[PDB]
Design a protein around this ligand. Structure first.
Ligand code: HEM
Ligand code: HEM
Ligand SMILES: Fc1cccc(CCCNCc2ccnc(-n3ccnc3)n2)c1
Ligand SMILES: Fc1cccc(CCCNCc2ccnc(-n3ccnc3)n2)c1
Ligand SMILES: C[C@H](O)[C@H](O)[C@H]1CNc2nc(N)[nH]c(=O)c2N1
Ligand SMILES: C[C@H](O)[C@H](O)[C@H]1CNc2nc(N)[nH]c(=O)c2N1
Ligand SMILES: [Zn+2]
Lengths: 407, 411
């Protein structure tokens, strides 16, 4: 019931008690750990509401107060008659920040409390959704000095009138499969691209074509909009030593913005709730560029560096990997766009973990996702034991809309 | 209940039925995953189920299940337990046992090799001098002049837990660490505690950076005793770099034989508290962990200095840059001296092939992702992208408290 976590590099030991408030289930049992699986009513709703308001009022040191009880009273009256309820602005802001505080896979949470929340609960059409999105984009980008943000569309009601952004990120490159057999652009988005096309996009069939938003308001069929090109800040990728690197033709976008998740606050589900912060270098250099089923550029880069590609034991992949990643960080920094390296970012998260241990009594964390996908054991998080559990409010995954949407 | 795992790079889906035979706990619940936590005298009562269980598997594997030979063996072990309270394994069962414990070891990336394991039965051993002699033969046979061979040596099982055989070293071969009065450490910081024990026990420490430690051996519950492995039996490799000539001048070497001496082998309820096993190194255990952990030799600084990297800001990735070089140097040194070693690309690829095979033949392969994924270049190895189920099968290797915490001193 009172669990310990040890850092094997510093012997610091922390006691986790927050896990005792674990609301949701893990996937794991005593018989089987699922630690590495990517994805494992009026009655229901009032307890969720109560648990949330309870934390809310606790956080502002008004727990058990007249104002606390009146709010419970009030939400309760509202569910009873209306079968749902609405969050006070303040509660919505606290909900969103805590959804982020609680994301056990996010290395960037030392930042959790400076989230800028944009309430779009008055939005009613896709055209409004488009407008709210562009403002989020522009506000967050901030000419390269990026700032965290979330934009929250109306909550689910009867599930026939959902708001959804069909893109998985606000900004992503398209993907086109050739007769030639291979793939042009991002193989991650091949399917979504086809939906853009079957829904009418005029794709320019290039390697780095920013996708159009496919927006769905109030259960309606989704509609297409291009993001003002001038709002999509991009970085050309150069190397500070290899002059030939620029010839590889590589750019990435500055603004990482997840748009397919579902935000759950005290029982309510915001199914369109795009959020954004800023990149840790490896996300692009290691994952986007080098994943075999992504841009997969390792072999091309290794060749330019003239490494012995005959045998895996030369570590040519490893050499190239490092250079690619130096070139990402370098390019963002030169163009003055916010980026964090995996050393600095994992070290922040260790400071953050202790804070949270000390102030909250814990910090749910998923080691499989927090350890960077290169140089693992030389970042501190590698030596850090982590307990993973599910707290609410939370961001959750949800099925891709082309499987659910009744046309 | 079927369970599916997915590879996110290739889209292969596998189906695990094996986890259905899992008995031991994991440390997780529906409300907590302890997947990144390093760590989680037996009655008649418990013992027969565990024996029966094991012997049904043994007999299945040899296609003799339900044979007269199967029945009689149950019969025999049965009587033996309630009369002597324990029992003795046949040779073939001990072998099968040892093999399966490796096969079941979810944190071992080397398991494609599980069926080629040389088992040495030291169950007739009775003294520490006998243990030393057994261990020497193991080192020499496994080393095989650099052409390394997997092996394990099995000392007698626990009885009342007052008579245990233990190897006090955590590995048969490892380097001394010496904390200095100024606060620094000479040699391997990981072994400072054990080193002090050895000194206290009578070892004259040379006090250099790469001093092979004396074996410290306990037989039959007795206080343990110091022996030096004959240096001629200890294969070592000097570390140099194919292109950097200043690399040799760092003074690095490592030993060739990775040999775990501190674990507990459980087979049909029997506990073998001394059971050193050895394979061959994946390059990263040395290049990444031993050399580059901050809590170990911690050489990144000095290596990056010599490559004259920009060390003023971590976003140079000078750490990552030195790290590749060191690992290249290790793989190159070993290969050049014809001492067996495997790089992490090659090791993880073989492991994926093993794991698929296991699903097809055995209906599963328990695997610990946190441990299987290498500690550099995680995502450019195919294991990163592999979903794994982790669960505990017997026979298995278990952890056990360090013997100096538990041993009753005789005097
Ligand atoms: C401030 C800079 C931020 C950094 C450096 C950062 C870093 C990361 C990283 C590296 C991951 C793993 C994602 C991957 O490998 O695809 C991640 C996941 C995540 N982050 Fe962040 N993050 C930041 C901001 C935010 C914000 C503003 C939110 C929400 C308001 C958020 C919520 C999450 C969630 C929910 C995940 C898990 C996503 C999933 O399961 O696919 N993060 N973060
Ligand atoms: C044949 C060559 C082998 C290779 C390349 C290999 C590779 C590895 C590696 C890299 C680890 C993680 C090491 C660490 O980080 O401490 C490991 C762990 C392990 N291996 Fe092997 N292994 C081999 C042979 C064996 C053998 C012969 C056995 C037993 C018969 C074995 C049983 C284990 C066990 C039980 C662990 C887990 C150790 C722990 O929990 O501390 N391996 N193996
Ligand atoms: F194919 C998949 C199915 C489900 C999850 C997956 C991994 C999530 C990848 N997206 C996470 C992501 C992407 C960009 N940016 C962020 N981000 C930005 C700030 N914090 C997180 N996060 C792949
Ligand atoms: F400080 C610690 C406490 C508990 C475990 C730890 C790491 C396990 C290190 N031993 C694993 C190891 C070492 C050498 N060789 C092998 N090996 C050989 C074959 N299979 C594994 N394994 C550190
Ligand atoms: C199978 C495994 O769960 C999967 O590859 C995970 C591993 N760790 C990860 N870690 C991060 N940060 N992001 C990811 O997408 C993944 N993928
Ligand atoms: C806390 C964490 O579990 C610990 O650092 C683990 C992580 N993965 C590992 N993986 C291997 N192979 N060996 C290790 O010692 C560790 N250490
Ligand atoms: Zn688990």
């Amino acid at each position: 019931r009172f669990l310990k976590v040890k850092n094997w590099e510093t012997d610091v030991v922390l006691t986790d008690t927050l896990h005792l408030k674990s609301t949701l289930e893990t996937g794991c049992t005593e018989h089987i750990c699922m630690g590495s699986i990517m994805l494992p009513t009026k009655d229901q709703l009032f307890p969720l509401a109560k648990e949330f308001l309870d934390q809310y009022y606790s956080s502002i040191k008004r727990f058990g107060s007249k104002a606390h009880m009146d709010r419970l009273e009030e939400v309760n009256k509202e569910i009873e008659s209306t079968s749902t309820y609405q969050l006070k602005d303040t509660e919505l802001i606290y909900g969103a920040k805590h959804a982020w505080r609680n994301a056990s896979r996010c290395v960037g949470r030392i930042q959790w409390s400076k989230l800028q929340v944009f309430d779009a609960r008055d939005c009613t059409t896709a055209h409004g959704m488009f407008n709210y999105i562009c403002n989020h984009v522009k506000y967050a980008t901030n000419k390269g000095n990026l700032r965290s943000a979330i934009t929250i569309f109306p909550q689910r009601t009867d599930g026939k009138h959902d708001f959804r952004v069909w893109n998985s990120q606000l900004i992503r490159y398209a993907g086109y499969k050739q007769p030639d057999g291979s793939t042009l652009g991002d193989p991650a988005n091949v399917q979504f691209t086809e939906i853009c096309i079957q829904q009418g996009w005029k794709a320019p069939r290039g390697r780095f074509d920013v996708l159009p938003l496919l927006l769905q308001a109030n259960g309606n069929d989704p509609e297409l909009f291009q993001i003002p090109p001038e709002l999509v800040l991009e970085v050309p990728i150069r190397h500070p030593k290899f002059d030939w690197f620029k010839d590889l033709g590589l750019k990435w976008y500055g603004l990482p913005a997840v748009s397919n998740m579902l935000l759950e606050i005290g029982g309510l589900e915001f199914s369109a709730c795009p959020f954004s912060g800023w990149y840790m270098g490896t996300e692009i250099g290691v994952r986007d560029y080098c994943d075999n089923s992504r841009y997969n550029i390792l072999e091309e880069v290794a060749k330019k560096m003239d490494l012995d590609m005959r045998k895996t034991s030369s570590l040519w992949k490893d050499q190239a990997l490092v250079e690619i990643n130096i070139a990402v960080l370098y390019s963002f920094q030169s163009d003055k766009v916010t980026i964090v390296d995996h050393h600095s970012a994992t070290e922040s998260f260790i400071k953050h973990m202790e804070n949270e241990y000390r102030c909250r009594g814990g910090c749910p964390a998923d080691w499989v996702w927090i350890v960077p996908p290169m140089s693992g054991s030389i970042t501190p998080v590698f030596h850090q034991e982590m307990l993973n559990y599910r707290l609410t409010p939370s961001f959750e995954y949800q099925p891709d809309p082309w499987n659910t949407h009744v046309w």
